[PDB]
Design a protein around this ligand. Structure first.
Ligand code: ZN
Lengths: 79, 9
């Protein structure tokens, strides 16, 4: 199910979002992170940026580079 | 959609 495990806190300034059809990441304004709930199925095909708007496209920072910028245990899921 | 937000201004 798309209500994937764990959660953070707040909306704050500009954020990331995960694809619920794979697991790839995209940088978004906080106006989208306030619209997307845990139940909201955000995916690559819906992505704002047509350069990255597929499960087959790339991302702004690889999962082991982004999770280090936040300083967190993301991608450890393997799923 | 499990995610987070960067501590980088
Ligand atoms: Zn995807």
């Amino acid at each position: 199910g798309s209500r994937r495990a764990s959660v953070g806190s707040e909306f704050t300034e500009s954020a990331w979002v995960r694809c619920d059809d794979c697991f790839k990441w995209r940088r978004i304004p906080a106006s989208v992170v306030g619209s997307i709930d845990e139940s909201s199925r955000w995916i690559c095909m819906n992505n704002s940026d047509k350069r990255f708007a597929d499960c087959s496209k790339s991302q702004e920072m690889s999962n082991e580079e982004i999770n280090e910028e936040l300083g967190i245990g993301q991608d450890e899921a393997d799923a | 959609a499990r995610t987070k937000q960067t501590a980088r201004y």
